[PDB]
């Protein structure tokens, strides 16, 4: 009393694989296996997955649907001091969609592009061209492909960029795509999860739909089993490498969503004894599953590339946008019936974000709905107001220094900022609030206890993973650059404070909480870690 | 091994109230829920109320509700059923049940204790 | 509240035979639910059948259960004089919490 519930339960599913299933399961996934030894790294990664991963996935969705709120009142009426978390959860699914959903806006540009028999980045000699470019992928940084400057100097103009500090004009053609995103955003968020539930069925089924045409494609390319060597071929020798168990860990953390408080916002609309632990091994299964998938689909060009098109493997196989809005469509141009490969390339990218988007926004809208009955009594209103505040900021990344933009927030939206969330959720939940406390909680929702081996996971392994993450990757830090292009400081400095914005609210609202709360010290805790349930 | 022994119980008058106890060991008794179970002497099954490991969560039956309160004491490892306003139909043999687990079931009994309600 | 029907109420089997008893709810119970309780004469119940296909520690092979929905069956394969007594189910799917009316096994003499 009372909650709106799912329309029924697949489009909570649906809401959850087409959350967590993005281009992150194409464009790192794959790239990974090959750079680790293949089937190799399976095994760090499945290894992680079971301890590190699927603990914390598990558990933001059971504390979802169990204190039946959104992230800022869930941790509210969790442990009072801590209800910092849920603020820092949300405003950094908050910084995130400033620019996420430009990725979005680039798949909608290059769709439209599409409509032509004859795909304008298969060529040389166009006007944006300069005399250095190849017809393919090459190792030299001065010669960019034929795809690489349709992309930089023409989709982009990131040429006329000189830096962050140079934004340039605003292109109006990207604006349009960005708008039109959240234009599909806002008719899909329009009405809650009655709608939102809904439309999911179709961005989250038809990636697959797509995924399975390009496997059958790709599959029957002269070359596509060399690509499938190079993707899969094992290597032990990795499994003994630091860096690979930290590649494994780190992909396995961000593949899954924890942090954004999507998972706890999505899981809230559940009926209370629904079994949310068949949903989060279902769920969790299926979205690596499908970034396996994804690997044959993309290497198994990836190796046609190499044995056909004359190009070496290193330099075709990549990771970020560069495969996707780059080197695939290199590929997709050389083959017969090239438009429908490029067409519904380009809307399985534009699908395997906007469901991304979906969840990333419903964070924010279910956190302070809950929060704020105000806004909680006119939804249309807020999102509208929200998506305004996107759109103006976000004709930024429309302009021609944009993706200067999108990198700076990429790298400090979260980076650590997410870890550290995370970190103190799985702190808060197994020692604060205690493990004997939540796995009673789940009794009494789904019939039976956790195992202990997903409390041992919640108390011991998934802080130290989480930290075995952040330590590594504070190890191997240096300053922000793009390609040639090196950041300026003042513009690190702006990520940190990106970062730290979030992060700050934990610290921040316990002193607050703190303060607020009479008696002495040892009795002021125990009133901020007492349950909103005792 | 597992051993579950009720006490208290014997004869009281309609109206008034009384405490059963159920001794649990042979197992942590803080990781699991107990119910208490009864059987009328026509020798019918009726679940009373049930009890969460840390108490946290409890169901009682419509027939029940407003008299019986169940309790529990993780130290001590020991169940409890305080009952008041005690009807002539609450006589039974009251049972001290274990199960965590729904899909499980009750796994353990004890030897039960009787209460008979009369004038 | 779900009400569990036992039938038969009483029993008679020569040992060796086979015997089925039947356990019907007023509403569908989880397969996973729906558990068996065999109580001899003079003492406590003992968990016997649990998530209706699955026997308890202790419990001789020749006991199995099936069923699913509203209905639902324990069967003796092969009776033996150990074997009578009262066999009680119950479901565990939701409060407040059912027995059934029971069902009484006695050897035939």
């Known amino acids: 009393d009372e909650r709106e519930t799912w329309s029924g339960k697949v489009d909570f599913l649906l809401s959850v694989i087409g959350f967590a299933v993005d281009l992150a399961n194409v464009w790192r996934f794959p790239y990974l296996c090959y750079k680790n030894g293949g089937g190799a790294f399976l095994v760090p990664y499945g290894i992680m997955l079971a301890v590190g991963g699927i603990p914390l996935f598990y558990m933001e969705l059971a504390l979802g649907q169990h204190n039946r709120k959104g992230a800022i009142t869930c941790w509210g009426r969790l442990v009072p001091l801590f209800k910092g978390i849920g603020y820092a959860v949300v405003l950094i699914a908050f910084y995130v969609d400033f620019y996420y959903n430009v990725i979005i806006a680039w798949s909608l540009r290059f769709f439209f592009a599409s409509f032509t028999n004859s795909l304008p980045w298969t060529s040389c000699n166009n006007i944006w061209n300069t005399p250095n470019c190849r017809p393919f992928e090459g190792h030299v940084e001065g010669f960019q492909s034929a795809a690489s400057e349709y992309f930089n100097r023409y989709i982009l103009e990131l040429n006329r960029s000189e830096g962050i500090h140079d934004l340039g004009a605003i292109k109006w053609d990207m604006a349009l795509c960005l708008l039109i995103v959240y234009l599909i955003c806002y008719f899909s968020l329009w009405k809650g999860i009655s709608t939102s539930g809904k439309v999911v069925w179709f961005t989250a089924l038809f990636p697959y739909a797509v995924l399975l045409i390009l496997l059958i494609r790709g599959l029957t390319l002269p070359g596509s089993f060399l690509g499938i060597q190079y993707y899969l071929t094992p290597n032990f020798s990795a499994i003994y490498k630091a860096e690979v168990w930290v590649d494994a860990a780190t992909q396995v953390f961000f593949s899954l969503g924890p942090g954004f408080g999507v998972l706890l916002a999505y899981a809230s609309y559940n009926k209370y004894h629904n079994n949310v632990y068949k949903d989060a091994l279902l769920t969790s299964f299926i979205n690596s599953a499908t970034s396996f998938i994804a690997g044959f689909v993309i290497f198994s060009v990836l190796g046609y590339m190499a044995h056909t098109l004359g190009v070496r493997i290193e330099d075709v196989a990549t990771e970020g946008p560069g495969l996707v809005f780059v080197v695939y469509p290199a590929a997709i141009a050389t083959m017969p019936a090239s438009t429908f490969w490029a067409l519904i390339f380009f809307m399985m990218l534009a699908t395997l974000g906007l469901d991304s988007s979906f969840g990333g926004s419903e964070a924010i809208i279910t956190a302070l709905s809950d929060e704020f009955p105000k806004i909680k009594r006119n939804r249309e209103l807020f999102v509208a107001g929200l998506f305004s505040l996107y759109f103006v900021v976000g004709l930024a990344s429309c302009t021609q220094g944009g993706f200067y933009f999108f990198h700076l927030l990429d790298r400090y939206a979260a980076g650590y900022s997410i870890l550290v969330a995370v970190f103190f959720e799985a702190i808060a939940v197994s020692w604060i609030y205690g493990t004997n406390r939540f796995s009673e909680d789940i009794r009494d929702m789904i019939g039976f206890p956790p195992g202990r081996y997903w409390q041992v996971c919640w108390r011991f392994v998934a802080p130290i993973f989480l930290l075995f993450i952040t330590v590594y990757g504070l190890i191997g830090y240096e300053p922000l650059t793009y390609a040639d292009y090196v950041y300026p400081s003042w513009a690190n400095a702006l990520g940190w404070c990106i970062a730290g914005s979030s992060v700050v609210m934990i610290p921040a609202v316990a002193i607050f909480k703190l303060l607020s709360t009479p008696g002495s010290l040892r009795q002021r805790f125990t009133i901020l870690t007492t349950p909103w349930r005792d | 091994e597992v051993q579950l022994v009720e006490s208290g119980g014997g004869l009281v008058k309609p109206g008034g109230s009384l405490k059963l106890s159920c001794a649990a060991s042979?197992?942590?008794?803080?990781?699991?829920?107990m119910s208490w179970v009864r059987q009328s002497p026509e020798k019918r099954l009726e679940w009373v109320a049930e009890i969460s490991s840390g108490g946290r969560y409890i169901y009682y039956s419509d027939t029940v509700t407003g008299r019986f309160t169940i309790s529990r004491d993780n130290a001590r490892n020991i169940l409890h059923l305080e009952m008041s306003s005690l009807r002539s139909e609450d006589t039974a043999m009251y049972y001290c049940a274990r199960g965590e687990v729904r899909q499980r079931g009750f796994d353990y009994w004890g030897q039960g204790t009787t209460l008979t309600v009369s004038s | 509240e779900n009400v569990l029907t036992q039938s038969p109420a009483i029993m008679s089997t020569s040992p060796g035979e086979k015997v089925t008893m039947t356990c019907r709810a007023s509403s569908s119970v989880g397969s996973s639910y729906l558990h068996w309780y065999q109580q001899k004469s003079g003492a406590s119940p003992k968990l016997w059948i649990y998530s209706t296909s699955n026997l308890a520690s202790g419990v001789p092979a020749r006991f199995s259960g099936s069923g699913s929905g509203t209905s639902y069956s324990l069967t003796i394969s092969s009776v033996e004089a150990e074997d009578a007594a009262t066999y009680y189910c119950q479901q565990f799917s939701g409060y407040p919490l059912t027995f059934g009316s029971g069902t009484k096994l006695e050897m035939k003499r």
């Open positions: 042979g197992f942590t008794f803080s990781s699991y829920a």
